[PDB]
Amino acid sequence: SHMNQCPEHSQLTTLGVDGKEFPEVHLGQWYFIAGAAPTKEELATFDPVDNIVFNMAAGSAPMQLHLRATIRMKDGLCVPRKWIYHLTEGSTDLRTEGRPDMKTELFSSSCPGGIMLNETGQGYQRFLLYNRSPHPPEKCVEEFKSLTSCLDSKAFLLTPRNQEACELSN
């Protein structure tokens, strides 16, 4: 029996020589590229968004990362966000304090310079695609849509990225 798998994708792992290269390898800037979810409503929050730039930094205490983002809305306005992720020994999963109920799984990406998140939470799930480049190859994005659709997240949103990034700070 055959023809019943989704394209190859793997969860990031802290295993193997170079395992403790997580998280330092992923620090720095990222751009939001696309989302996919079981329903359009799980992506609705992104509909007035033109682009988002993020900066991930080492935290102010041991197992913690500082995330900063500025959202360019389609109306030109810039909205800054900030939060803290918590890391756990031997895992690449992210947890944020609101709430203990949600987790974020990290997956490797066919996009060079890309990463995919799988966000799980109360009554919802969505897949989120980021890249170091604000303009990764269209093929990367097609592959993310094809993968997420195979995983039954068929509602898809591509961020337009027509306008300049808002300023962030590193």
Ligand X SMILES: CCCCCCCCCCCCCC(=O)O
For ligand X, the binding residue among 9, 26, 132, 161 (CB under 6 A) is 26
Q: How far is the CB of 130 from ligand X (least distance, A)?
A: 5
- Determine the residue with CB nearest ligand X: 26
To the nearest whole angstrom, how small is the minimum distance from the Cβ of residue 5 to ligand X?
Answer: 26
Q: Could you say which residues in the range 105-134 bind ligand X, by CB under 6 A?
A: 106, 115, 119, 128, 130
Cα(first)–Cα(last) distance of the chain, in Å? 50
CB-nearer residue toward ligand X: 87 or 147? 87
Is residue 56 at the binding interface for ligand X, with CB under 6 A as the rule?
yes
As a three-state string, the secondary structure of the chain is CCCCCCCCCCECCCCCCCHHHCCHHHCEEEEEEEEEECCHHHCHHHCCEEEEEEEEEECCCCCEEEEEEEEEECCCCEEEEEEEEECCCCCCCEEECCCCCCEEEEECCCCCCEEEEEEEECCEEEEEEEECCCCCCHHHHHHHHHHHHHCCCCEEEECCCCCCCCCCCC
Considering the complex, what minimum distance in angstroms separates the CB of residue 74 from ligand X?
A: 17
Of 6 and 58, which has the nearer Cβ to ligand X?
58
Q: Can you say whether the dihedral through the CA atoms of 131, 88, 149, 158 is positive or negative?
A: negative
Verify binding: residue 54, ligand X, rule CB under 6 A.
yes
Stretch that binds ligand X, among 3-11, 22-30, 135-143, 152-160 (CB under 6 A): 22-30
23 binds ligand X (CB under 6 A): yes
What residue ranges bind ligand X (CB under 6 A)? 23, 26, 30, 54, 56, 65, 106, 115, 119, 128, 130
Which positions make up the binding site for tetradecanoate? 119, 126
